[PDB]
From a paper:
We obtained CrtE crystals in two different crystallization conditions. The crystal formed in 0.2 M ammonium acetate, 0.1 M sodium acetate (pH 4.6) and 30% (w/v) PEG 4000 had 6 copies in the asymmetric unit, and the crystal generated in 0.1 M sodium citrate (pH 5.5) and 20% (w/v) PEG 3000 contained 2 copies in the asymmetric unit. In both cases CrtE crystals had the same space group - P212121. Each CrtE monomer is composed of 14 α-helices (A to L, and α1) joined by connecting loops. The two aspartate-rich motifs, FARM and SARM, are located in helix D and H, respectively, forming a large catalytic cavity for allyl substrate binding. α-helices (D, E, F1, and F2) form a large tunnel-shaped pocket which is hypothesized to be involved in prenyl chain elongation according to previous structural studies. The inner surface of the pocket is filled with hydrophobic amino acids (Ala-80, Ile-84, Met-87, Leu-126, Phe-130, Leu-151, Val-155, and Leu-160) which, based on previous studies on prenyltransferase enzymes, are predicted to determine the chain length of the final product. In addition, residues in helices E, F1 and F2 at the homodimer interface are non-polar. Notably, the side chain of Phe-130 in helix E is involved in a π-π interaction with its counterpart in the other subunit, which also has been found in A. thaliana GFPPS and Sulfolobus solfataricus HexPPS. As shown in the electrostatic surface potential map, there are a number of positively charged amino acid residues (Lys-53, Arg-54, and Arg-56) located at the bottom of the catalytic cavity, which are proposed to bind the IPP substrate. Binding sites for Mg2+ and DMAPP could not be obtained in this study, but have been reported in previous structural studies of GGPPS from S. cerevisiae, Plasmodium falciparum, and Corynebacterium glutamicum.
Author numbering: 9 to 171, 174 to 232, 258 to 259, 263 to 297
């Protein structure tokens, strides 16, 4: 028996997208929900929710334990894009060929749509049905650290301050460490939801950190080249050593080999 990532991604992406859709039921001021759904339901790879389910499932958890957190992660990812596209930031006029949130609804609504998604992410983790509350709190804490000044937002800030040819290699590492912070918390949250012991959470953390780095190397070899691609390989190789789980680890090993 051999493992097809394309099938897995297809199966998972389907279940994730119905969950995303169900999470935002349209009421009161319909424009806010519309603006949220517009960015959240515009398709994509959905790697972040999938990493979460992967990690949870590998450790013995179920889709039902991780699904809310998985949607939460995608909501956070979405709102970072909504905010990043704003004129005051990257000033993007379209994304995946479709116009960006603010171009459809206005900068004001876009800002609020992002805010709504960010807070809803936490609300949603906390409404997770069948999981001890202690685990959910840990996810919420880690999610907080990943998204804020010590993570995603932190990275975006350093990124903006460097947006300079003389930029150091360590300034490149802090910038890309924060997109890894989102990525790390995907597998970390999954593990915690499953009831993983701290050593496992660290195992996954380091796996996530390594993958995160590798992604930005190859995206740079489109930050680079013959030795750049060597590093990306050493790192994905170290990661793909979570052999202790054997067959259960196929999705994560597969997913890693995005080179």
């Amino acid at each position: 028996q051999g493992f097809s990532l394309a099938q897995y991604l297809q199966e998972q992406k389907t279940i994730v997208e119905t969950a995303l859709d169900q999470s935002l039921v349209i009421t009161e001021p319909v424009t806010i929900y519309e603006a949220m759904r517009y960015s959240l339901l515009a398709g994509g790879k959905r790697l972040r929710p999938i990493l979460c389910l992967a990690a949870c499932e590998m450790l013995g958890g179920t889709a039902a334990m991780a699904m809310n957190t998985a949607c939460a992660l995608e909501m956070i990812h979405t709102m970072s894009l909504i905010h990043d596209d704003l004129p005051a930031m990257d000033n993007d006029d379209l994304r995946r060929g479709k116009p960006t949130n603010h171009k459809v609804y206005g900068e004001d609504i876009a800002i609020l749509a992002g805010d709504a998604l960010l807070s809803y992410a936490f609300e949603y983790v906390a409404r997770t049905p069948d999981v001890p509350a202690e685990r959910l709190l840990q996810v919420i804490v880690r999610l907080g650290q990943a998204v804020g000044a010590e993570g995603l937002v932190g990275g975006q800030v350093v990124d903006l301050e460097s947006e300079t040819d003389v930029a150091v290699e360590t300034l490149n590492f802090i910038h890309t460490h924060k997109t890894g912070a989102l990525l790390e918390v995907c597998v970390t949250a999954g593990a915690i939801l499953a009831g993983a012991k701290p050593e496992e959470v660290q195992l996954l953390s380091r796996y996530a950190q390594n993958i995160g780095l590798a992604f930005q190397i190859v995206d740079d070899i489109l930050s680079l080249e013959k030795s750049q691609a060597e590093a990306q390989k050493l790192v994905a190789e170290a990661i793909a050593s979570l052999e202790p789980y054997g067959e259960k680890a196929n999705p994560l090993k597969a997913l890693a080999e995005y080179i």
